[PDB]
Amino acid sequence: STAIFSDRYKGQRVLGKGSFGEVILCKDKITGQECAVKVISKRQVKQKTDKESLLREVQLLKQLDHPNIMKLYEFFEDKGYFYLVGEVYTGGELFDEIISRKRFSEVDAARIIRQVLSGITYMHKNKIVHRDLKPENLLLESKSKDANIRIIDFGLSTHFEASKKMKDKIGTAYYIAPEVLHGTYDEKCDVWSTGVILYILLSGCPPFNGANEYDILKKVEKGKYTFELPQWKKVSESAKDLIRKMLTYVPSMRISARDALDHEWIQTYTKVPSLDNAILNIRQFQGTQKLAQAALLYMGSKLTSQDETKELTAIFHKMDNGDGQLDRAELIEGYKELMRMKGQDASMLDASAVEHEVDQVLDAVYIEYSEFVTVAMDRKTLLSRERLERAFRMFDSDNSGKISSTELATIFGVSDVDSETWKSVLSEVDKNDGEVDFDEFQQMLLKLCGN
Ligand SMILES: CC(C)(C)n1nc(Nc2cccc(Cl)c2)c2c(N)ncnc21
Numbered sequence: 397s398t399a400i401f402s403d404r405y406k407g408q409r410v411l412g413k414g415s416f417g418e419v420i421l422c423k424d425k426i427t428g429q430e431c432a433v434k435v436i437s438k439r440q441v442k443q444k445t446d447k448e449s450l451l452r453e454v455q456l457l458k459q460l461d462h463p464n465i466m467k468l469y470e471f472f473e474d475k476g477y478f479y480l481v482g483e484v485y486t487g488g489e490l491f492d493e494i495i496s497r498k499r500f501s502e503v504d505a506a507r508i509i510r511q512v513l514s515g516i517t518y519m520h521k522n523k524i525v526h527r528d529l530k531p532e533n534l535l536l537e538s539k540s541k542d543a544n545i546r547i548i549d550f551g552l553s554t555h556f557e558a559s560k561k562m563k564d565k566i567g568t569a570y571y572i573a574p575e576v577l578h579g580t581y582d583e584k585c586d587v588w589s590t591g592v593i594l595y596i597l598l599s600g601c602p603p604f605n606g607a608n609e610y611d612i613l614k615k616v617e618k619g620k621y622t623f624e625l626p627q628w629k630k631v632s633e634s635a636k637d638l639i640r641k642m643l644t645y646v647p648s649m650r651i652s653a654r655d656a657l658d659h660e661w662i663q664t665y666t667k668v669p670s671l672d673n674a675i676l677n678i679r680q681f682q683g684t685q686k687l688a689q690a691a692l693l694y695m696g697s698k699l700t701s702q703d704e705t706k707e708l709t710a711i712f713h714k715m716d717n718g719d720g721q722l723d724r725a726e727l728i729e730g731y732k733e734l735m736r737m738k739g740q741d742a743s744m745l746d747a748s749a750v751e752h753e754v755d756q757v758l759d760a761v762y763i764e765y766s767e768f769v770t771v772a773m774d775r776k777t778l779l780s781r782e783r784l785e786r787a788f789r790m791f792d793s794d795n796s797g798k799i800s801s802t803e804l805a806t807i808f809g810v811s812d813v814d815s816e817t818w819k820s821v822l823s824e825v826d827k828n829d830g831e832v833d834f835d836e837f838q839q840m841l842l843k844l845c846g847n
């Protein structure tokens with residue numbers, strides 16, 4: 397490949413973490429067009445196919461166009477990374493918008509799922525399967541009332557191997573089709589996933605639920621679920637009929653994405669009481685998923701920070717007369733060497749991004765390099781520490797300031813943290829019971845990652 401990513405685009409801001417890599421807000425250096433770029437590290441992510449298979453799917457994906465599918469513009473590849481450049485959406489995740497509004501009904505759910513099914517139907521006609529369809533992959537085009545839903549990451553699971561790390565697997569077991577767990581699957585796995593999303597939109601509870609990942613997967617694999625919750629009494633029988641056809645265990649007997657669009661419930665509710673119990677259960681579910689995710693990313697960032705702190709200190713030690721002071725030019729070289737040894741960071745695309753990152757640290761801090769490391773490494777974790785407190789405060793819906801032991805079991809259950817391990821961890825931080833405040837919860841996570 398004779399085309400460089402950094403020569404055409406410049407990083408502006410980090411948008412978040414997606415499947416297989418970080419998503420950066422970028423801008424074309426000539427035309428000024430803003431774009432979302434997913435950076436996939438070749439070291440941290442294995443390819444399921446060859447280079448020729450990936451290049452041909454990317455070429456197809458670039459020519460495809462549907463209003464409920466993300467637009468892919470470009471694709472780049474250097475020695476250690478893949479860069480998927482496409483359209484940026486600012487409306488956020490679909491479930492984050494549902495928890496904000498006070499009224500939600502079957503007319504809203506039908507309008508949501510019709511968009512999702514139009515996108516899936518279109519992508520299935522072009523022989524492209526998602527496999528990992530879940531609410532996080534449903535983004536809203538803009539912060540508007542009539543904001544369309546854009547499905548992201550279509551086709552990536554065919555070419556990139558799924559992560560085994562829980563910080564990347566969180567919230568996926570609820571939506572995965574049984575045939576995907578056993579290896580023989582086709583496009584019908586995306587109808588199952590949509591069916592699960594539809595079940596959560598109308599009730600606020602996953603149909604296959606459990607206290608941990610393996611318990612959820614056991615339920616999925618058995619394939620049995622009920623409509624025995626009181627909230628289903630308020631919902632129509634045609635909605636229940638569609639879910640039954642979408643959550644049909646044998647994929648050949650399961651409804652297609654196309655035939656799901658012609659279903660009576662779609663055509664009737666896109667041409668009625670508000671589900672108030674569903675909104676309260678989606679709000680609770682979203683808060684729980686986001687706090688467990690923030691806890692895992694907080695522990696990861698603390699481990700990444702400890703490794704990078706000690707590695708950067710050794711680089712500045714070898715570069716030092718002995719007094720412990722270094723110049724701006726030396727600090728940039730030592731910082732650039734940290735990326736050459738531990739891979740390029742998603743936030744810093746080129747040498748200019750590193751030069752400005754050192755300038756931002758030196759604004760706060762011949763300068764003491766031990767002081768520079770402390771500040772520079774706290775800026776790498778800033779997003780993970782603040783997101784944890786924000787996620788703890790959002791989860792604490794009644795603003796009591798604490799979370800019960802029952803909520804800790806549910807949070808640590810979704811994080812796959814062993815019950816006996818976290819129960820032993822709270823006794824060391826708080827000896828004398830039943831609940832923890834944010835400081836104690838943060839102290840528990842610090843002890844769970846060797847601190
Ligand atoms: C994960 C977040 C929500 C940050 N995200 N993911 C996004 N998905 C994405 C981006 C680039 C390439 C590819 Cl293959 C997917 C995405 C997007 N488009 N706009 C805005 N936020 C996006």
Ligand SMILES: [Ca+2]
Pocket residue numbers: 792793794795796797798799
């Ligand atoms: Ca509380």
